[PDB]
Amino acid sequence: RVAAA
Amino acid sequence: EKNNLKVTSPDSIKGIYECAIGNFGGTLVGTVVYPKSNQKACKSYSDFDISFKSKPGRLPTFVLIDRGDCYFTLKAWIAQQAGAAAILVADSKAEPLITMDTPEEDDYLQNITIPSALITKTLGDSIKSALSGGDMVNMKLDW
């Protein structure tokens, strides 16, 4: 799980 | 991925908790502060005249910041400018931890220095509840 915001 | 942080005080919530370090040294002990305003750290804290600089001889400030409205790296950059020694981003929903990533868009990214970590909403609410009760929340980062 990867996110910028 | 996942790492560790240790709430050292107060006894009510002290212990070891999972966390996810941002994708952008040594041991570090700080005290947690949840800002009155600008809780998502999407605008400069000097606009609110809010600083997290620690007085000489006192613990560095770990700023607790809510997730949302802006990039994680902007939150870390804005907290870093306000004098915070680390940033803890409380997830906006109860879910497994995620890895905060770089915006990709499409610097200041090369100028982010302070440690960054995403914690759960559960731990975020527990920290806020201890601070609201009047207790200082100390924490140890070993990354």
**Alpha carbon B124 to its chain's center:** 10
Residue of B nearest to A4 (CA): B101
Token digits for B77? Answer: 């950059």
Task: Tell me if B6 sits within 8 A of B139, measured CB to CB.
Answer: yes
Distance of alpha carbon B98 from alpha carbon B60, whole angstroms: 26
Residues 6+ apart with CB under 8 A from B134: none
Distance of alpha carbon B133 from alpha carbon B127, whole angstroms: 10
Binary contact (B23, A3; C-beta < 8 A): no
Cβ pairs bridging A and B (under 8 Å) = 28
Residue of B70, B101, B102 to mutate for A, most A C-beta atoms under 10 A: B101
**Residues of chain A contacting residue B77, judged by C-beta atoms under 8 Å apart:** none
Q: Is B129 helix (H, G, I), strand (E, B) or coil?
A: helix
Token digits for B67? Answer: 């997730």
The region that residue B52 occupies, defined by phi over 0 for left and psi between -120 and 50 for alpha, beta otherwise, is alpha
Q: Resolution of the coordinates in A? A: 2.5
Distance of alpha carbon B21 from alpha carbon B92, whole angstroms: 16
B101-104, Cβ contacts within 8 angstroms, sequence gap of 24 or more: B101/A2, B101/A3, B101/A4, B101/B23, B101/B24, B101/B72, B102/A4, B102/B23, B102/B24, B102/B73, B103/A4, B103/A5, B103/B71, B103/B73, B103/B74, B104/A4
